[PDB]
Enzyme design. Structure first.
Site, PDB file in Angstrom:
ATOM      1  N   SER A  66       4.373   4.744   7.555  1.00  0.00           N
ATOM      2  CA  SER A  66       4.982   5.501   6.441  1.00  0.00           C
ATOM      3  C   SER A  66       5.896   6.638   6.891  1.00  0.00           C
ATOM      4  O   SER A  66       5.885   7.101   8.038  1.00  0.00           O
ATOM      5  CB  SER A  66       3.938   6.028   5.496  1.00  0.00           C
ATOM      6  OG  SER A  66       3.175   4.961   4.983  1.00  0.00           O
ATOM      7  N   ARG A  72       1.954  10.550  12.508  1.00  0.00           N
ATOM      8  CA  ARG A  72       2.671   9.668  11.556  1.00  0.00           C
ATOM      9  C   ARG A  72       3.109  10.448  10.318  1.00  0.00           C
ATOM     10  O   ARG A  72       2.756  11.628  10.162  1.00  0.00           O
ATOM     11  CB  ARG A  72       1.805   8.468  11.150  1.00  0.00           C
ATOM     12  CG  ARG A  72       0.377   8.778  10.738  1.00  0.00           C
ATOM     13  CD  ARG A  72      -0.334   7.496  10.328  1.00  0.00           C
ATOM     14  NE  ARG A  72      -1.729   7.720   9.997  1.00  0.00           N
ATOM     15  CZ  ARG A  72      -2.741   7.649  10.848  1.00  0.00           C
ATOM     16  NH1 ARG A  72      -2.528   7.368  12.124  1.00  0.00           N
ATOM     17  NH2 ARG A  72      -3.964   7.875  10.415  1.00  0.00           N
ATOM     18  N   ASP A  73       3.885   9.791   9.466  1.00  0.00           N
ATOM     19  CA  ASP A  73       4.129  10.161   8.043  1.00  0.00           C
ATOM     20  C   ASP A  73       5.112  11.331   7.929  1.00  0.00           C
ATOM     21  O   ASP A  73       4.799  12.357   7.335  1.00  0.00           O
ATOM     22  CB  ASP A  73       2.838  10.470   7.286  1.00  0.00           C
ATOM     23  CG  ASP A  73       1.786   9.383   7.362  1.00  0.00           C
ATOM     24  OD1 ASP A  73       2.165   8.210   7.663  1.00  0.00           O
ATOM     25  OD2 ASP A  73       0.610   9.701   7.083  1.00  0.00           O
ATOM     26  N   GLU A 131      -3.389  13.123   5.908  1.00  0.00           N
ATOM     27  CA  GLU A 131      -2.324  12.102   6.029  1.00  0.00           C
ATOM     28  C   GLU A 131      -1.238  12.355   4.982  1.00  0.00           C
ATOM     29  O   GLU A 131      -1.436  13.112   4.027  1.00  0.00           O
ATOM     30  CB  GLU A 131      -2.885  10.690   5.879  1.00  0.00           C
ATOM     31  CG  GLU A 131      -4.219  10.482   6.577  1.00  0.00           C
ATOM     32  CD  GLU A 131      -4.626   9.033   6.730  1.00  0.00           C
ATOM     33  OE1 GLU A 131      -4.615   8.314   5.724  1.00  0.00           O
ATOM     34  OE2 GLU A 131      -4.996   8.628   7.851  1.00  0.00           O
ATOM     35  N   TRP A 158       0.861  -1.196   0.000  1.00  0.00           N
ATOM     36  CA  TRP A 158       0.000   0.000   0.000  1.00  0.00           C
ATOM     37  C   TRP A 158       0.891   1.239   0.000  1.00  0.00           C
ATOM     38  O   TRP A 158       1.548   1.427  -1.026  1.00  0.00           O
ATOM     39  CB  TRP A 158      -1.139  -0.097   1.023  1.00  0.00           C
ATOM     40  CG  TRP A 158      -0.883  -0.154   2.497  1.00  0.00           C
ATOM     41  CD1 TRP A 158      -1.207   0.829   3.387  1.00  0.00           C
ATOM     42  CD2 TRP A 158      -0.433  -1.277   3.280  1.00  0.00           C
ATOM     43  NE1 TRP A 158      -0.960   0.415   4.661  1.00  0.00           N
ATOM     44  CE2 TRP A 158      -0.476  -0.865   4.631  1.00  0.00           C
ATOM     45  CE3 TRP A 158       0.007  -2.574   2.998  1.00  0.00           C
ATOM     46  CZ2 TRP A 158      -0.103  -1.695   5.685  1.00  0.00           C
ATOM     47  CZ3 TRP A 158       0.371  -3.393   4.048  1.00  0.00           C
ATOM     48  CH2 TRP A 158       0.335  -2.956   5.371  1.00  0.00           C
ATOM     49  N   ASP A 159       0.880   2.081   1.017  1.00  0.00           N
ATOM     50  CA  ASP A 159       1.611   3.370   0.994  1.00  0.00           C
ATOM     51  C   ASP A 159       3.024   3.128   0.482  1.00  0.00           C
ATOM     52  O   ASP A 159       3.731   2.279   1.038  1.00  0.00           O
ATOM     53  CB  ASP A 159       1.725   3.982   2.384  1.00  0.00           C
ATOM     54  CG  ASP A 159       0.436   4.376   3.053  1.00  0.00           C
ATOM     55  OD1 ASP A 159      -0.630   4.091   2.505  1.00  0.00           O
ATOM     56  OD2 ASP A 159       0.543   4.952   4.155  1.00  0.00           O
TER      57      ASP A 159
HETATM   58  O1  LIG Z   1      -5.021   1.806   4.089  1.00  0.00           O
HETATM   59  C1  LIG Z   1      -6.294   2.363   3.787  1.00  0.00           C
HETATM   60  C2  LIG Z   1      -7.178   2.526   5.016  1.00  0.00           C
HETATM   61  O2  LIG Z   1      -8.419   3.069   4.636  1.00  0.00           O
HETATM   62  O3  LIG Z   1      -7.331   1.217   5.569  1.00  0.00           O
HETATM   63  C3  LIG Z   1      -8.194   1.181   6.724  1.00  0.00           C
HETATM   64  C4  LIG Z   1      -7.709   2.079   7.849  1.00  0.00           C
HETATM   65  O4  LIG Z   1      -6.521   1.539   8.438  1.00  0.00           O
HETATM   66  C5  LIG Z   1      -7.429   3.479   7.333  1.00  0.00           C
HETATM   67  O5  LIG Z   1      -6.764   4.245   8.338  1.00  0.00           O
HETATM   68  C6  LIG Z   1      -6.555   3.434   6.086  1.00  0.00           C
HETATM   69  O6  LIG Z   1      -6.401   4.747   5.560  1.00  0.00           O
HETATM   70  O1  LIG Z   2      -1.333   2.377   6.735  1.00  0.00           O
HETATM   71  C1  LIG Z   2      -1.160   2.795   8.103  1.00  0.00           C
HETATM   72  C2  LIG Z   2      -1.803   4.169   8.347  1.00  0.00           C
HETATM   73  O2  LIG Z   2      -0.987   5.162   7.658  1.00  0.00           O
HETATM   74  C3  LIG Z   2      -1.723   5.703   6.593  1.00  0.00           C
HETATM   75  O3  LIG Z   2      -1.630   4.795   5.497  1.00  0.00           O
HETATM   76  C4  LIG Z   2      -1.157   7.048   6.185  1.00  0.00           C
HETATM   77  O4  LIG Z   2      -1.305   7.958   7.277  1.00  0.00           O
HETATM   78  C5  LIG Z   2      -3.164   5.692   7.117  1.00  0.00           C
HETATM   79  O5  LIG Z   2      -4.149   5.819   6.103  1.00  0.00           O
HETATM   80  C6  LIG Z   2      -3.227   4.347   7.820  1.00  0.00           C
HETATM   81  O6  LIG Z   2      -4.163   4.316   8.906  1.00  0.00           O
END
Ligand SMILES: OC[C@@]1(O)OC[C@@H](O)[C@@H](O)[C@@H]1O
Ligand SMILES: OC[C@H]1O[C@](O)(CO)[C@@H](O)[C@@H]1O
Ligand SMILES: OC[C@@]1(O)OC[C@@H](O)[C@@H](O)[C@@H]1O
Ligand SMILES: OC[C@@]1(O)OC[C@@H](O)[C@@H](O)[C@@H]1O
Ligand SMILES: OC[C@@]1(O)OC[C@@H](O)[C@@H](O)[C@@H]1O
Ligand SMILES: [Mg+2]
Ligand SMILES: [Mg+2]
Ligand SMILES: [Mg+2]
Length: 477
Positions: free
Chosen positions: A159, A240-241, A333, A68-69
């Site tokens: 991230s 975060r991030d 985010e 994902w990220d």
């Molecule tokens: O990764 C995508 C997401 O929608 O998944 C479910 C939760 O963990 C959210 O914080 C996150 O943004």
């Molecule tokens: O994936 C872990 C967390 O970090 C993010 O991806 C970016 O802030 C959120 O959407 C998620 O809750």
């Protein structure tokens, strides 16, 4: 239209106490600019702000990894660097064959890396982007050492960014998170989130890219409860991030933007007229007490700023937040500062489902422009803040990526974690397309950034969709 809050874009001293507001009057422009979809179409957003429909037959980035990220190997100027003829990316990863479902993967996240030969056009690479999975970036057990002996059921690596910079040549700024949860996912104690750094060395030959090091994880920042909300203030806080960068206006400093929440005890009635953003004489203004009564006080996003206090960048301090979304949205985010034409673009991602009552907008990327890293930020696109959304009907319920509402566009959650790269290219990952969950990189798209407005280029790649996971280097390291 509701009257949007004007903004000057003027710069402030990064050290000064000024926070720009993304006001309710600004965010209400998104629905104001939207149209009731002409059935069978299910998109209400302006075409220039809509991400094209991703094919349902998208490839996985890797069959053995949920990805994902994602972020590139970069420098503190936002350049994306190749190393010895290889392109490199870093991703949050989880194991699809480990017994937890896709929606429960976040507490299992490990940072992984992928690489591929530099300098091949996207349409000449394999359809999946040709990423070679190198495995986990950090040694097992190295990240969790930042927490010491605290009660804990899971730890995750969330991230940040990678900076090409002591045989170590890569600094990984990331978010270390610790959870203490019952089997039903409820918090026994609040999560712990620490913005951290680990240094290592990228190495390569003709056959592969690999890393050494990342044995020593340094805690840099944890929320103070003065500017950035703590787990004691709100068990559901976000912190975060880290996006670490150099501001040409402040030579000799290194800055970081990151996601936070406004530092109040959960349930505090702390929103103000400035968060609503109406003229006192506007006959169509919202009432502050009515807005707080509607539950908007549970949405308190901010974008934080920190600055390094030593030359080695191992000690940091908080500065006041640069953007707040109080009574607008709980999530801003993966913030990034994107420099273009002497202006400062703040890009940040958010969800439809984390909007406050009475405000609405799509999942995607939000943008603001100003004359400095601390500005009276101008929300892009008709003073709205929306840069690019998934196709969405804002006149029907949002649903959820695990339970799509058939009255809603089945691509409303098609992509998330949009990251803006040099030249306005935007990379993201696939969450849900109809019944199919992704955990794979999305097609790269292109936005044309023109002062206070943006346009999705629908002639980029195939009808606006570039290569899956096209995250290219613009400069060799
Ligand atoms: O990764 C995508 C997401 O929608 O998944 C479910 C939760 O963990 C959210 O914080 C996150 O943004
Ligand atoms: O994936 C872990 C967390 O970090 C993010 O991806 C970016 O802030 C959120 O959407 C998620 O809750
Ligand atoms: O009114 C705010 C402002 O104009 O005040 C003077 C300076 O402190 C500037 O940085 C700042 O933007
Ligand atoms: O073209 C219409 C559609 O319903 O056809 C079947 C699938 O490919 C869907 O993703 C797609 O939206
Ligand atoms: O919600 C009230 C407020 O004063 O809280 C602190 C900062 O987020 C400010 O931008 C915001 O207007
Ligand atoms: Mg192992
Ligand atoms: Mg809503
Ligand atoms: Mg219907």
């Amino acid at each position: 239209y509701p009257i949007p809050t004007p903004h000057s874009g003027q710069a402030y001293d990064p050290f000064a106490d000024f926070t720009a507001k993304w006001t309710r009057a600004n965010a209400r422009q998104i629905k104001a600019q939207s149209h009731v979809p002409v059935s069978p179409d299910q998109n209400s957003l302006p075409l220039n702000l809509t991400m094209p429909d991703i094919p349902a037959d998208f490839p996985q980035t890797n069959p053995d990894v949920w990805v994902w990220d994602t972020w590139p190997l970069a420098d503190v100027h936002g350049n994306q660097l190749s190393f010895q003829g290889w392109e490199v990316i870093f991703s949050l990863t989880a194991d699809p064959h480990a017994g937890y479902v896709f929606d429960d993967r976040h507490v299992h996240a490990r940072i992984g890396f992928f690489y591929r030969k530099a300098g091949i056009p996207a349409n000449q690479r394999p359809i999946d982007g040709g990423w070679i999975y190198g495995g986990h970036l950090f040694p097992d057990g190295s990240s969790v050492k930042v927490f010491g002996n605290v009660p804990m059921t899971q730890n995750a690596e969330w991230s940040g960014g990678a900076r090409f910079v002591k045989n170590n040549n890569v600094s990984l700024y990331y978010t270390a998170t610790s959870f203490n949860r019952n089997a039903q996912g409820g918090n026994i104690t609040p999560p712990i989130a620490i913005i951290s750094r680990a240094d290592g060395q990228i190495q390569a030959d003709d056959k592969h890219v690999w890393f050494t090091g990342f044995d020593q994880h340094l805690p840099l920042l944890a929320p103070d409860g003065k500017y950035y909300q703590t787990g004691q203030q709100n068990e559901f806080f976000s912190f975060r991030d880290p996006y670490v960068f150099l501001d040409p206006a402040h030579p000799g400093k290194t800055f970081m933007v990151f996601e936070g929440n406004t530092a109040v005890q959960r349930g505090s009635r702390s929103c103000t007229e400035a968060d609503l953003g109406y003229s006192p004489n506007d006959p169509n203004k919202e009432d502050l007490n009515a807005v707080m009564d509607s539950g908007a006080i549970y949405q308190m996003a901010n974008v934080g700023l920190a600055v390094a206090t030593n030359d080695e960048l191992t000690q940091w301090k908080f500065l006041p937040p640069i953007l707040s979304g109080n009574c607008v949205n709980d999530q801003t985010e993966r913030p990034q500062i994107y420099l273009k034409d002497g202006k400062y673009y703040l890009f940040t991602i958010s969800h439809r489902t984390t909007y406050a009552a009475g405000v609405d907008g799509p999942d995607g990327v939000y943008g603001f422009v100003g004359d400095g890293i601390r500005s009276d930020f101008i929300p892009l696109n008709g003073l709205s803040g929306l840069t690019l959304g998934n196709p969405t009907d804002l006149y029907q319920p949002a649903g959820a990526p695990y339970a799509l509402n058939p009255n809603q566009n089945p691509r409303t959650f098609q992509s998330y974690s949009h990251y803006v790269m040099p030249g306005g290219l935007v990379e993201s990952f696939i969450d849900a397309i109809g019944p199919r969950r992704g955990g794979a990189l999305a097609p790269t798209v292109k936005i044309n950034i023109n002062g206070t407005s943006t346009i999705l280029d629908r002639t980029y790649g195939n009808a606006g969709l570039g290569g899956y996971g096209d995250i290219p280097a613009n400069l060799p390291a």
